Each structure stands twice: as structure tokens, then as C-alpha cells.
Amino acid sequence: TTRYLLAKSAAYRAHLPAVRHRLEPLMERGLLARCGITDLEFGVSARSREDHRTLGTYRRDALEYVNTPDTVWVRAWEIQEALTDKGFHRSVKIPDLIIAAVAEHHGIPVMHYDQDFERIAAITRQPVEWVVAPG
Amino acid sequence: TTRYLLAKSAAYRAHLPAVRHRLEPLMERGLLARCGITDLEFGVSARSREDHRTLGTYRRDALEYVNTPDTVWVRAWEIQEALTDKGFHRSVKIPDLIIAAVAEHHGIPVMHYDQDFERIAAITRQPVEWVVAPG
């Protein structure tokens, strides 16, 4: 039904059996999504220039593209402001703010393995989901 | 004449006398630029929610805005690919790729204090400048 914007923390664990068990059916159904910044974070995992090309081909084959509206910069600033008094603005990574803003714009959950997405969602009220139960 | 897109590595050193000596005249002349992502990285330095607001007001008063075109995501991916064989894709931060793409789009140098901008410029041939001589 709804797609999930897959965050690095889950993608980098796609090889673990429980995580694969969740991600493979979503992928086969076309329910995993990517955007500009999640592709960039995925590209860090390349092991050669050609492998970076292989990874790009995989991502374009396996995850549905969603656009990044130009509102993400201010939205991320708003979220960062709301995280500041608790001090989370110094630990929540800038790319994760952008990912959250993209997912919120499209009305899709972020699928992740990082409590920081729960810290963002406490502010935005947007849907987020652990790829597998954290415990 | 030309503006400079100010990167975090220089902004975070604005209090050092040599750096202030370079940045204050540029600021007074309206020659320092900001974009969505450089403002986000600056916001990490806030020391309270209200201070985050103070910092935002300062940035809007002190640095000229430039837009972030939707081409930055693919441009950053291209740069990351060209950094991959040397291994720099695993150390050059995603926000710095975006900053470089913004500056390149606008034809303005990045003003920085991080050799990673020189690694990017070796690929793109775009202008970059140390805020003060690195040595």
C-alpha cells in the first residue's frame, strides 16, 4: 500500500536475516522508496568506482524515486530548532532531518534503525517505523 | 565582486582573529553567501532554542541567500562517484558534496577550512578558497 522511505540505518543492515526478511517483500512489491539524499548516503558503501555504478543501478531498479521539494531546507531548520533545547540538534544528523522532511512531504513513513527518527517524529508527528523491532 | 559560499569549517572558526579579519569585510560588503544546507550545519552550534532563533536572524542579516537547485542530488552523486576509487567517498561528508554543487551552480567559490573541498574541486574544477592560508 504505502511506500517507505528507506534510511541508511536500515539499508546498511539489509544483509542481516531479520532485516532482509522485512525488506525483500517490500522491495519486490515496489514499496521501498529512495530520494536524492538517501542515494548519496547509500553510495558511501561502494567498494570501487564501478561498484558505485552497480549500486546506483541497483537502487534505481529496486526503490521507487520520490522528489525532494525545495521546502526541505526550512522544514529541516524548524525540526532542528525544536530539537535544540534537548540538545538533539547536536546529535541528529543533517541528512536525517532532510530524509524526514522528504518523507513527511510525501506522506510516507521513514523505515529506519535509528532512534533519532523517533526523536524527529515526536516533533513532526509523521509516521516512522523500525525495520525490525528494536529489541 | 563575487560572493563566497561559506562552509561550516570556516564559519565555526569565525571567532579566530585571522579568520575574523577575512570574514568581517566580506560580510560588511555582502559578499558571504548561505544556502539551505549551510544554514542547517550552522544551526548545530546553537546553545538553546532561542539561540537557534538568534543564529537564524544573524545568518539572514549577514549572508546573502542563494537557492539550491534540484540538480544537486545527481551532481553530488557524480562527484561522489569520482571520489570513490581513491576512497574519499567514505570521508567526504554528504553535506559538503551538496555545498559544492550549490556553489558550482551559482559560479561562486566555496570559502572553507577543510581539504575535502580541494578534493572535490580537483574533480569539478570549481573555485574553492581557504578562508586563511592553511599553513
Swiss-Prot record, chains A, B:
Keyword RNA-binding attached: no
Gene: vapC21
InterPro entries tied to this protein: PIN-like_dom_sf, PIN_dom, Type_II_TA_system_RNase, VapC_family
Stated family: Belongs to the PINc/VapC protein family.
Enzyme Commission no: 3.1.-.-
Key words, A-Z: Hydrolase, Magnesium, Metal-binding, Nuclease, Toxin-antitoxin system
GO BP term (any one): negative regulation of growth
An example molecular function term from Gene Ontology annotations: magnesium ion binding
Residues that bind Mg(2+): A7, D96
Protein's UniProt name: Ribonuclease VapC21
Annotated PANTHER family: RIBONUCLEASE VAPC2
UniProt enzyme class: hydrolase
Ubl conjugation in keyword set: no
A Pfam entry, by short name: PIN
Organism from which the protein derives: Mycobacterium tuberculosis (strain ATCC 25618 / H37Rv)
Cofactor: Mg(2+)
